[PDB]
């Protein structure tokens, strides 16, 4: 029936039919004003700011402590009966033994895991409980499947990290990592293998975070405040969140790919029973014998500094190392496998479960009840508000996962908007929205070292430089003789590695082409898909998938940006919040046709477990598609390098199913009927630093952070002594004029300017230069001037605006409309902003007089704005 497609400060949403109609639906208005409904399309955006609110706190050590306490409590619930049979008070004395002799004996002898592993003799149950407690306390860290050689393979997950980094930067894409060398040495050795990468780079810092350093990604993304990261450190989730939400959500699973690389390196250094338990034999032996030998040598040589080493907690020695708040790095400096601590990459649960298998099997015979609970104990370690926690568990804090916190709330009521009906496709994407410096850097490096698609659009829509170069099948072998020149561009970094292939790339050439467009490397969208797939599929699949029942699609926005340029459905951002809505419309337009046309490609871009069909089988000879592009059938005509044009059918369908998937004579008509002006654009209301101003009975008085607490306790006395309207509260008056409450001292524009698509698409065509249509320009300015008088109320500035167009009327249609785009900033909802219109500038105002609000109508909007409670007092 329908479909849905979905930044730092905006969340776009839209709804789409098979013919790409955005539904026009009335919305009930429950306010006392003479307004019962509004005709708005099922499209829009949600804007938000990054501020310290309740949600900001909710999406940011205590919860980790409670999780570990719950895990150990679940273990103790099983252990308690036999524990009381052995030692009743052992559990309570933990934050070791109840008597001095046993305690001291355990102190020199075992100040256990691999004795439960190797020794077959029956051991004390206290010892097993302690072993399992340290099993489940430091569980570690991402893999649903069982442990296999594939998880550990350093090459495999390093390559996975390289792909996730390279397909996030299309312009700029074991013996070393598992070596028993210094972490800095391993990092330098890895960096030396990749030219053009520095230690301070994002990739060098990610490798270090996989290795053990303390990378600071602030220099990698130009932040103002420190962004220390440390996997071993407890609060790595919170610090990771703060950094990535300062710098954008797209790198979250880049960082998590680094995290899994660290996991792989740990597993690798371990397995070459429970080999981590052999590694802790190494750790314990070195630590304890080195401590004893140091004690002996200090006794024999420096008796005075002995007490400083072993008994002065305040000083920087071992005494402060173990019992005080002293780090290892200073301790080694005062005096890396010498004296490693108990609370120290978080060892993968694949390693730990390897011990749970090793420990329990070696002792399952002697204790029958532990053998019976073999599978349960495995589930204890590997099992997992909660949704607020998981986004906190993801690699992003509120700052930009506020929208990803919103995008769930956006979609959750969007389900209600369409009457609980479920969408077929939900396309999501994340990209930075500084690239001009990027294209400059490669040119500087490429020169220092020393238009047509390489593969045409018939095989895939790739207008990026990786495919663009300034017969029908890719470059012929006659052209392949130029590869000597292509090699000089590869080593000069003027071209990427895959481009060196694609130029020289039959069917094996086309096999990788489809995958890149559809396979999604941004797994944050997969994590969002996981959230979408978990919240949608409560009815778990019976077997072999465990999940089905309505799809989650993650297409790249590249299938949209190409879709915009081809068929006259262009986008202008600064006009209004429709451009996010326009992308959210042209996002899922791709989804409806692609799946019904190529169901075999489902596994490549849709969430869930599916049969991996051989792409070689689907690609055929010159006689679904021979030409590999999934979006060829959108065009009626196919363009090749030679200039020969391949015809296409008027109506497209799927051969193996027979369903019509594409109506060229009818679907193109409906799309233009979409972009042409009432749309659900909703600004979510959110709670000497004043928080919010409450109406007083009439005037507004601000409440600082301190006063609110006393306000909730005794509001009457607090109101009496001086003599909730949240920030950006919708304030409407007279002919649709709208205001938002910036503070007690200022107001904001709440009126969104709209344009019928003829006036929209023209602006992009003009700005990116139909010259007979110069009469559209006068109407646009007139429509702007008419819009300015009704709601903006800046008649002093507006007179200059109308004059300025008269001064520069001789200028071309292009530059004129480009300055019109900047002129649109005056009308946009939100904080007013100064701008330049031709030479004429200023055009800025501050609605400090808020007296209108006292008699105005408030409109308390939901996130989608459907349920409005308009209370007008006057």
From Swiss-Prot:
Gene3D superfamilies cross-referenced by the UniProt entry: 1.10.30.50, Ribonuclease H-like superfamily/Ribonuclease H
Annotated spans, ARM: 51-66
Effect of residue 429 to A: Only cleaves 1 DNA strand, probably the noncomplementary strand. Processes guide RNAs correctly. In vivo, loss of Cas9-mediated CRISPR interference in plasmid transformation
Residues annotated as the enzyme's active site: 453 (proton acceptor for hnh nuclease domain)
Cofactor list: Mg(2+)
Positions of Mn(2+) 1 binding: 429, 433
Applications: Coexpression of Cas9 with an artificial single guide RNA (sgRNA) which fuses the crRNA with the tracrRNA in human cells has shown it is possible to target and modify DNA sequences of interest. Cas9 plus the 2 sgRNAs have also been expressed individually in human and mouse cells to achieve DNA targeting; cleavage efficiencies of the artificial sgRNA were lower that those for systems with the 2 sgRNAs expressed separately. Microinjection of Cas9-encoding mRNA and a synthetic sgRNA into zebrafish embryos induces targeted mutations.
Segments for region (PAM-interacting domain (PI)): 686-874
Domain remark in the UniProt entry: Has 2 endonuclease domains. The discontinuous RuvC-like domain (approximately residues 1-62, 718-765 and 925-1102) recognizes and cleaves the target DNA noncomplementary to crRNA while the HNH nuclease domain (residues 810-872) cleaves the target DNA complementary to crRNA.
Physiological role: CRISPR (clustered regularly interspaced short palindromic repeat) is an adaptive immune system that provides protection against mobile genetic elements (viruses, transposable elements and conjugative plasmids). CRISPR clusters contain spacers, sequences complementary to antecedent mobile elements, and target invading nucleic acids. CRISPR clusters are transcribed and processed into CRISPR RNA (crRNA). In type II CRISPR systems correct processing of pre-crRNA requires a trans-encoded small RNA (tracrRNA), endogenous ribonuclease 3 (rnc) and this protein.
UniProt-recorded name of the protein: CRISPR-associated endonuclease Cas9/Csn1
């Amino acid at each position: 029936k329908y479909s849905i497609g979905l930044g730092t400060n905006s969340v776009g949403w839209a709804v789409i039919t098979d013919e790409y109609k955005v539904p026009s639906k009335k919305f009930k208005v429950l306010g006392n004003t003479d307004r019962h409904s509004i005709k708005k399309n099922l499209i829009g955006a949600l804007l938000f700011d990054s501020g310290e609110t309740a949600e900001a706190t909710r999406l940011k050590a205590r919860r980790r402590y409670t999780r570990r306490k719950n895990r150990i409590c679940y273990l103790q619930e099983i252990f308690s009966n036999e524990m009381a049979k052995v030692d009743d008070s052992f559990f309570h004395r933990l934050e070791i033994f109840g008597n001095i002799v046993d305690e001291v004996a355990y102190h020199e002898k075992y100040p256990l895991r691999k004795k439960l592993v190797d020794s077959t003799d029956k051991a004390d149950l206290r010892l097993i409980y302690l072993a399992l407690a340290h099993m489940i306390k430091f569980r570690g860290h991402l893999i649903e499947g069982d442990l296999n050689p594939d998880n550990s393979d350093v090459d495999k997950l390093f390559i996975q990290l390289v792909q996730t980094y390279n397909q996030l930067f299309e312009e700029n894409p074991k013996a070393i990592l598992s070596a028993r060398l210094s972490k800095s040495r391993r990092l330098e050795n890895l960096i030396a293998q990749l030219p053009g990468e520095k230690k301070n780079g994002l990739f060098g810092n990610l490798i270090a975070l996989s290795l053990g350093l303390t990378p600071n990604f602030k220099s990698n993304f130009d932040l103002a405040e420190d962004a220390k990261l440390q996997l071993s450190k407890d609060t790595y989730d919170d610090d990771l969140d703060n950094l990535l939400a300062q710098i954008g959500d797209q790198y979250a699973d880049l960082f998590l790919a680094a995290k899994n690389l660290s996991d792989a390196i740990l597993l690798s250094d371990i397995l070459r029973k429970a080999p981590l338990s052999a590694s802790m034999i190494k750790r314990y032996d070195e630590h304890h014998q080195d401590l004893t030998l140091l004690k002996a040598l200090v006794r024999q040589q420096l008796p005075e500094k002995y007490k400083e080493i072993f008994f002065d907690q305040s000083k920087n020695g071992y005494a402060g190392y173990i019992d005080g708040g002293a780090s290892q790095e200073e301790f080694y400096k005062f005096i890396e496998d010498l004296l490693r601590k108990q609370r120290t990459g978080s060892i993968p649960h694949q390693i730990h479960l390897g011990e749970l298998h090793a420990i329990l099997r070696r002792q399952e015979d002697f204790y029958p009840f532990l053998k019976d609970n073999r599978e349960k104990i495995e589930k204890i370690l590997t099992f997992r508000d909660s949704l607020h926690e998981h986004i906190a568990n993801l690699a992003g804090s509120p700052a930009i996962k506020k929208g990803i916190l919103q995008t769930v709330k956006v979609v959750d009521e969007l389900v209600k908007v369409m009457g609980r009906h479920k969408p077929e496709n939900i396309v999501i994407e994340m990209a930075r929205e500084k690239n001009s410096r990027e294209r400059m850097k490669r040119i500087e490096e490429g020169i220092k070292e020393l238009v047509d698609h390489i593969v045409p659009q018939s095989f895939l829509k790739d207008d990026s430089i990786d495919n663009k170069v300034l017969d029908n099948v890719p470059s012929e072998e006659v052209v392949k003789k130029m590869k000597n020149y292509w090699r000089q561009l590869l080593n000069a970094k003027l071209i990427t590695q895959r481009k060196f292939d694609n130029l020289t790339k039959s069917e094996l050439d086309k096999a990788g082409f489809i995958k890149r467009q559809l396979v999604e490397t941004r797994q944050i969208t997969k994590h969002v898909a996981q959230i979408l797939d978990s919240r949608m599929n409560t009815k778990y699949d019976e077997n072999d998938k465990l999940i089905r029942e309505v799809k989650v699609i993650t297409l790249k926005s590249k299938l949209v940006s190409d879709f915009r340029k081809d068929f006259q459905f262009y986008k202008v951002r600064e006009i209004n919040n429709y451009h996010h809505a326009h992308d959210a419309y042209l996002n899922a337009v791709v989804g409806t046709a692609l799946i019904k046309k190529y169901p075999k490609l489902e596994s490549e871009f849709v969430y869930g477990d599916y049969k991996v069909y051989d792409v070689r089988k689907m690609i055929a000879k010159s006689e679904y598609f021979f030409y590999s592009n999934i979006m060829n059938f959108f065009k009626t005509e196919i363009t090749l390098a030679n200039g020969e044009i391949r015809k296409r059918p008027l109506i497209e369908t799927n051969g193996e199913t027979g369903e019509i998937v594409w109506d060229k004579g009818r679907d193109f008509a409906t799309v233009r009927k979409v972009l042409s002006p009432q749309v659900n654009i909703v600004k979510k209301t959110e709670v000497p630093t004043v928080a919010y101003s409450v109406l007083v009975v009439k005037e507004l008085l601000g409440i600082t952070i301190m006063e609110r607490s006393s306000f909730e306790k005794n509001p009457i006395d607090f109101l009496e002594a001086k003599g909730k309207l949240p920030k950006y509260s919708l304030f409407e008056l007279e002919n649709g004029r709208k205001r938002m409450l910036a503070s007690a001292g200022e107001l904001q524009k709440g009126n969104e300017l709209a344009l019928p698509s003829k006036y929209v698409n023209f602006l992009y065509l003009a700005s990116h230069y139909v010259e007979q249509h110069k009469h559209y320009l006068d109407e646009i300015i007139e429509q702007i001037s008419e819009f300015s008088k009704r709601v903006i109320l800046a008649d002093a500035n507006l007179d200059k605006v109308l004059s300025a167009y008269n001064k520069h009327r001789d200028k071309p249609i292009r530059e004129q409309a480009e300055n019109i785009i900047h002129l649109f900033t005056l009308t946009n909802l939100g904080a007013p902003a100064a701008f330049k219109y031709f030479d004429t500038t200023i055009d800025r105002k501050r609605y400090t007089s808020t007296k209108e609000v006292l008699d105005a109508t408030l409109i308390h909007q939901s996130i989608t704005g459907l349920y409005e409670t308009r209370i007008d007092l006057s």
